[PDB]
Design a protein around this ligand. Structure first.
Ligand code: 4ZO
Ligand code: K
Ligand code: K
Length: 164
């Protein structure tokens, strides 16, 4: 079945709780596998101890730059970048999990969780999962963002991994 993974998130060292995500390995196996492995840390790098560096209220919460912590970095389990797998899954509403990118075929490790329907991204960002549980936690993260994307508190993935 599809992987169930988790992110435990704090704000300035205070727990906000757990986001549980389903990864759609049945539709985007390569993209799913990348995210799953970055949650477990099994390749010797990944998301644990990294940040949500760009959070825009009424839009999305962005994370995954575990090298530079500012949107310029990250890498995949495959190498520095990997192709756009497919655009089968769409940005249908809040809780969609999708890959951030710098253009076509530039997926690395950065990702975003939508807090609205972001359909203008369809065909441009690879959607690969959604929030199973903890949309309230996502909303808390969202609350520490700003229209610029800068966060007012340090938002940290203190733990992460795979439930099933
Ligand atoms: C809603 C999300 O909007 C975006 O993706 C806007 N673009 C963005 O944040 N780019 C950060 C980024 C920079 C480099 C890569 N990768 C590479 C070089 O391999 C992946 C992502
Ligand atoms: K806007
Ligand atoms: K863990």
């Amino acid at each position: 079945g599809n992987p169930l993974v988790y992110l435990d998130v704090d704000a300035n060292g205070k727990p906000l709780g757990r986001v549980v995500l389903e990864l759609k390995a049945d539709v985007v196996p390569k993209t799913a596998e990348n995210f799953r492995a970055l949650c477990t840390g099994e390749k010797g790098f990944g998301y644990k101890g990294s940040t949500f560096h760009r959070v825009i209220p009424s839009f999305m919460c962005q994370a995954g730059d575990f090298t530079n912590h500012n949107g310029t970095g990250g890498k995949s389990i495959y190498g520095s970048r990997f192709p756009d797998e497919n655009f089968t899954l769409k940005h249908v509403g809040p809780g969609v999990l999708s890959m951030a990118n710098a253009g076509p075929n530039t997926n690395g490790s950065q990702f975003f969780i939508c807090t609205i329907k972001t359909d203008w991204l369809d065909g441009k960002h690879v959607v690969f999962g959604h929030v199973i549980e903890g949309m309230d936690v996502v909303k808390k993260i969202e609350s520490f963002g700003s229209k610029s994307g800068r966060t007012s508190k340090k938002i940290v993935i203190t733990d992460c991994g795979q439930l099933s």
